[PDB]
Amino acid sequence: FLPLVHNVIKCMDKDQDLNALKTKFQELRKLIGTMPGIHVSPEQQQQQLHSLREQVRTKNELLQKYKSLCMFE
Amino acid sequence: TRERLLSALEDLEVLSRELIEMLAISRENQVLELLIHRDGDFQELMKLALNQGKVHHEMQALEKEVEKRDSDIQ
Amino acid sequence: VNLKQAILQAWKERWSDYQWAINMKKFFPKGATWDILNLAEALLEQAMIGPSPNPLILSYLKYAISSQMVSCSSVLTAISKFDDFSRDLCVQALLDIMDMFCDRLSCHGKAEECIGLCRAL
Amino acid sequence: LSKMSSLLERLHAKFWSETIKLVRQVMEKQHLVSCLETLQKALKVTSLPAMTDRLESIARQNGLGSHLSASGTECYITSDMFYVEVHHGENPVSCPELVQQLREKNFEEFSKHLKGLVNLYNLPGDNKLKTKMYLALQSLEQDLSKMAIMYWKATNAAPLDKILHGSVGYLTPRSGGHLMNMKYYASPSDLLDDIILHEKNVPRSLGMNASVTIEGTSAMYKLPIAPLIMGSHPADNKWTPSFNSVDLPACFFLKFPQPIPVSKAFVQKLQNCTGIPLFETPPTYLPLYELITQFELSKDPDPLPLNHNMRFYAALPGQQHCYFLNKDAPLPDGQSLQGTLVSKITFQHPGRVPLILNMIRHQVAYNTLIGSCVKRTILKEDSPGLLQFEVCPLSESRFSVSFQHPVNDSLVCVVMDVQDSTHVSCKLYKGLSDALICTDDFIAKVVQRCMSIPVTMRAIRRKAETI
């Protein structure tokens, strides 16, 4: 990316918009991450995701235990 | 952490711009540090993109599952 | 017979060539009886040297016989039937080291043993 | 270390609104930047044309001028050799190894290999004597290949006999120096790895051999311009006369992988069989024992310094043994064993270099069989055991080791001399008033097959405990 542009600039000035392009790429990547969930620290996000998955699994297990083995009939 | 990745990428870009300006005004360690920073920024961006995709998938799946379970329970 | 093992150890743990006599006299009363002298040292070391002079050992023998007994050395080097061996190498160093006997002197026996020295020659 | 301070200073100086504007103003208005961009692209990804441009930039940095001929793979031509796309000669064969190395990200290895292959043709000739030297080297390589083919026809055995006797080169296709040849030295350490076969891609990287080369010497040796060795003998290597030859300041050198310790007798035999002076300059002929010690030290190239001081030790198979080199002693002739370290030999004629190489290989193999007990194993504090066999050079290429016979009460000597290139004479000097330590046949089987001094002592101890 930057190497080809640097080589082109060196061949031109042997006797472009890389900064703005990198800024736009970083802005797009940050927007896509915040849309996906990359807005806070990675370890904290992973811990929160693991906790949410554990809570969902516990809720599903509780529902299966309370629904399958019905006490009344 | 989009903030840290954006900061690393901006620092690498600034170092590259300074090195390019110095080379243009002239006719080392700075270029090596700039290249190391750019490589680290690219690796961190790839890792963060993979983690963001995984987190989005997990968040959508857990949201759907928890919504279904909570609606049934309620 | 322990003198043989002591010399073999002195080889296994090579010495400063001056503490040699110190460690040698350490294993004996050093004056009670010397009838167990080097009459077996050179023969053993060279017969096990075989096709080799076994360096770093003859130097110790010389630094000893500088002031030691000489009749035993003579009777050994005379009884050393190296003709069957005839390696043409060990006898070289043997003559080289024994030339000192005729060079300096043939010492005294202080008794009739001196006459036996004659026999040796 | 101070990179953080430099980055902070750069971030403070640059501030983007000012950086982009300054760059645009400096753009609209030497080789260091080019080298930095090439180093950056070497770590960055590159497409087919981008990889071609990177290879061209690396060749320009290396001084080689090769224009981009194809987007897939260009023909690298530089002043001595023209590798095809796929000077003084075109690409001989499609070497896939160099192509894959230069195509992969590790193009530095391919660049170094090409530079080494091209510097050989970079003789002192001014495009006229250089061409003659290249033709002479090509003819010499062709004659060596013909001799190797004749040896293979006489006995088309596996690479074992090839490393035992035959050619003195690598078993790699004809590409500049390393032509297809049989191994020179029989390295016992290369016999296995924690194991040997006559495969096409056999262990060419293994073995204490090296391919021939053309070394620029001071004496204008009469190198043959045409192929002299054309007709050989059935069980020997014969040749024919010149015409013819050229008095060039170079020769067919056979620099081996490492300078093995060679005695003065080896130097004399080499100077007799070669004619040319073995030592191009006044060589410091040091003690042969000192040369053996230096060779044993350098045999383990690593940062671990030992300085065994002629006293090594290690753990035997069922015990722990030791060894005393006992250097700096007089030889059987009456003087000290003075020698040197042989590293290269400029072979004048290619019809007799085989016997010299075989003798050097036998001497180096004997040196290896001697020094196999030399190792950086720090086995100190071993009170019980530690049978330190005193091993010193007795005769010409003969190592004599005296060890305490545990079965007997006295010592016992073992002399191993380099009888042949593979068979080494062994004599066990025991005592008349001693028990049977071992048989000569067992020692022979332990030498001609293992040839490892510490392992030899271990096997002797095992046979003594058994018998």
Curated annotation (Swiss-Prot), chain A:
Example GO BP: positive regulation of transcription initiation by RNA polymerase II
Compartments reported by the entry: Nucleus
Cellular component aspect of the GO annotation: core mediator complex; mediator complex; nucleoplasm; nucleus
GO molecular function, one term: transcription coregulator activity
Keywords for the protein's UniProt record, in alphabetical order: Acetylation, Activator, Coiled coil, Nucleus, Phosphoprotein, Transcription, Transcription regulation
Post-translational modification Phosphoserine, affected residues: 41
Residues passing through the membrane, by range: none
Residue runs in coiled coils: 16-69
Protein's job: Component of the Mediator complex, a coactivator involved in the regulated transcription of nearly all RNA polymerase II-dependent genes. Mediator functions as a bridge to convey information from gene-specific regulatory proteins to the basal RNA polymerase II transcription machinery. Mediator is recruited to promoters by direct interactions with regulatory proteins and serves as a scaffold for the assembly of a functional preinitiation complex with RNA polymerase II and the general transcription factors.
Annotated family: Belongs to the Mediator complex subunit 9 family.
Name of the molecule in the record: Mediator of RNA polymerase II transcription subunit 9
Higher taxonomy: Eukaryota, Metazoa, Chordata, Craniata, Vertebrata
This protein's encoding gene: Med9
From Swiss-Prot, chain B:
Listed name of the protein: Mediator of RNA polymerase II transcription subunit 4
Subunit details: Component of the Mediator complex, which is composed of MED1, MED4, MED6, MED7, MED8, MED9, MED10, MED11, MED12, MED13, MED13L, MED14, MED15, MED16, MED17, MED18, MED19, MED20, MED21, MED22, MED23, MED24, MED25, MED26, MED27, MED29, MED30, MED31, CCNC, CDK8 and CDC2L6/CDK11. The MED12, MED13, CCNC and CDK8 subunits form a distinct module termed the CDK8 module. Mediator containing the CDK8 module is less active than Mediator lacking this module in supporting transcriptional activation.
Coiled coil segments of this chain: 1-74
Domain of life where this protein originates: Eukaryota
Protein family per UniProt: Belongs to the Mediator complex subunit 4 family.
Gene name tied to this protein: Med4
Reported function: Component of the Mediator complex, a coactivator involved in the regulated transcription of nearly all RNA polymerase II-dependent genes. Mediator functions as a bridge to convey information from gene-specific regulatory proteins to the basal RNA polymerase II transcription machinery. Mediator is recruited to promoters by direct interactions with regulatory proteins and serves as a scaffold for the assembly of a functional preinitiation complex with RNA polymerase II and the general transcription factors.
Organism name: Mus musculus (Mouse)
Compartment(s): Nucleus
Phosphoserine: residues carrying this PTM: 7
Residues of the full protein shown: 26 to 108 of 270
From Swiss-Prot, chain C:
Cellular localization per UniProt: Nucleus
Tissue specificity field: Expressed in the adrenal gland, brain, epididymis, heart, kidney, liver, ovary, pancreas, prostate, skeletal muscle, small intestine, spleen, stomach, testis and thymus.
Top-level taxon in the UniProt lineage: Eukaryota
Quaternary structure note: Component of the Mediator complex, which is composed of MED1, MED4, MED6, MED7, MED8, MED9, MED10, MED11, MED12, MED13, MED13L, MED14, MED15, MED16, MED17, MED18, MED19, MED20, MED21, MED22, MED23, MED24, MED25, MED26, MED27, MED29, MED30, MED31, CCNC, CDK8 and CDC2L6/CDK11. The MED12, MED13, CCNC and CDK8 subunits form a distinct module termed the CDK8 module. Mediator containing the CDK8 module is less active than Mediator lacking this module in supporting transcriptional activation.
Protein function: Component of the Mediator complex, a coactivator involved in the regulated transcription of nearly all RNA polymerase II-dependent genes. Mediator functions as a bridge to convey information from gene-specific regulatory proteins to the basal RNA polymerase II transcription machinery. Mediator is recruited to promoters by direct interactions with regulatory proteins and serves as a scaffold for the assembly of a functional preinitiation complex with RNA polymerase II and the general transcription factors. Required for basal and activator-dependent transcription.
Curated annotation (Swiss-Prot), chain D:
GO cellular-component term (any): nucleoplasm
Signal peptide: none
Cystine crosslinks: none
Post-translational modification (record): Phosphorylated by MAPK1 or MAPK3 during G2/M phase which may enhance protein stability and promote entry into the nucleolus. Phosphorylation increases its interaction with PSIP1.
Tissue: Widely expressed in the adult, with high levels of expression in the liver, lung, intestinal mucosa, kidney cortex, thymic cortex, splenic follicle and seminiferous epithelium in testis. Also expressed in the adult heart, brain, spleen and skeletal muscle.
GO biological process: androgen biosynthetic process; angiogenesis; animal organ morphogenesis; animal organ regeneration; brain development; camera-type eye development; cell morphogenesis; cellular response to epidermal growth factor stimulus
Gene Ontology molecular function: any one: nuclear retinoic acid receptor binding
Quaternary data: Component of the Mediator complex, which is composed of MED1, MED4, MED6, MED7, MED8, MED9, MED10, MED11, MED12, MED13, MED13L, MED14, MED15, MED16, MED17, MED18, MED19, MED20, MED21, MED22, MED23, MED24, MED25, MED26, MED27, MED29, MED30, MED31, CCNC, CDK8 and CDC2L6/CDK11. The MED12, MED13, CCNC and CDK8 subunits form a distinct module termed the CDK8 module. Mediator containing the CDK8 module is less active than Mediator lacking this module in supporting transcriptional activation.
Organism from which the protein derives: Mus musculus (Mouse)
Shown segment, full-protein numbering: 13 to 518 of 1575
